């Protein structure tokens, strides 16, 4: 059959703020397929505790490809409206005008992210993943599909 992921969302409007339909237990996958527009400066995928804007929802995991200069991916955590220490990954596979697949795997102590079938980065948990119930996608990105595999 054609359904290999759960709770699939197709061609969402960006910015996208959606409820994650089950718990992010170890082994859970979040799978996002899309493409970067030619003028992209950045986009972000945020795993959030709720969707409030005041106070702004905590972001357990901010995954933020940036396209200026040589490009990079910045990761961070937002707690009580304050950003923490950035973790920057310089070996970035994202490119303007190219399509991508992001697979975020939740593990016990960290997230692991693979892009286009290749391991890209790790990010240690700073907020318990049990607090995450919302997926936010913002910025200059086109999203084809979002799906989940819940453990
Ligand atoms: C309306 C708007 O522009 N919202 C932005 C916000 C605001 O600009 C910002 O929160 C106001 O302080 O920024 C968002 O991106 C931030 C996020 O990617 C973090 C991750 O660490 O980096 C912030 O920039 C850093 C920069 O990377 C550092 O080099 C610098 O020393 O500090 C900067 C500020 O901390 C980004 O602004 C956000 O999600 O908060 C994107 C929104 O669209
Ligand atoms: Cl782990």
From Swiss-Prot:
Please tell me where a carbohydrate binds in this chain.
Answer: 66, 76, 86
Q: In which tissues is it expressed?
A: Ubiquitous. Selective expression by prostate carcinomas versus normal prostate and benign prostatic hypertrophy.
Q: Does the keyword Cytoplasm apply?
A: yes
Feature type site, description Critical for binding to sialylated and sulfated oligosaccharides: 56
Q: Where in the cell is it found?
A: Cytoplasmic vesicle; Cytoplasm, Cytosol
Main location class: cytoplasm
The record's keywords, sorted A to Z, are: Autophagy, Cytoplasm, Cytoplasmic vesicle, Lectin, Repeat
| GO terms under biological process | cellular response to virus; lymphatic endothelial cell migration; plasma cell differentiation; T cell costimulation; xenophagy
Query: Might you report a single GO cellular component term?
Result: membrane
The Galectin domain covers 16-149
Q: Which GO terms describe its molecular function?
A: carbohydrate binding; integrin binding
**Membrane-spanning ranges:** none
What does the entry note on its domains?
A: Contains two homologous but distinct carbohydrate-binding domains.
Quote the subunit structure annotation.
Homodimer. Interacts with CALCOCO2/NDP52. Interacts with PDPN; the interaction is glycosylation-dependent; may participate in connection of the lymphatic endothelium to the surrounding extracellular matrix.
Described by its record, this protein's role is as follows: Beta-galactoside-binding lectin that acts as a sensor of membrane damage caused by infection and restricts the proliferation of infecting pathogens by targeting them for autophagy. Detects membrane rupture by binding beta-galactoside ligands located on the lumenal side of the endosome membrane; these ligands becoming exposed to the cytoplasm following rupture. Restricts infection by initiating autophagy via interaction with CALCOCO2/NDP52. Required to restrict infection of bacterial invasion such as S.typhimurium. Also required to restrict infection of Picornaviridae viruses.
Q: What is this protein called?
A: Galectin-8
Q: Which organism is it from?
A: Homo sapiens (Human)
């Amino acid at each position: 059959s054609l359904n290999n992921l759960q709770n699939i969302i197709y061609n969402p409007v960006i910015p996208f703020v959606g409820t994650i339909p089950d718990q992010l237990d170890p082994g859970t996958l979040i799978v996002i397929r899309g493409h970067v527009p030619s003028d992209a400066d950045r986009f972000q995928v945020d795993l959030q505790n709720g969707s409030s804007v005041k106070p702004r929802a905590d972001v357990a995991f901010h995954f933020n490809p940036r396209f200026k200069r040589a490009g990079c991916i910045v990761c961070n955590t937002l707690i009580n409206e304050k950003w923490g220490r950035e973790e920057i990954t310089y070996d970035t596979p994202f490119k303007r005008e190219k399509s991508f697949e992001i697979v975020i795997m939740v593990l016990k102590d960290k997230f692991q992210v693979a892009v286009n079938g290749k391991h890209t980065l790790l990010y240690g948990h700073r907020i318990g993943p049990e607090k995450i119930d919302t997926l936010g996608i913002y910025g200059k990105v086109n999203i084809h599909s979002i799906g989940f595999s819940f453990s």
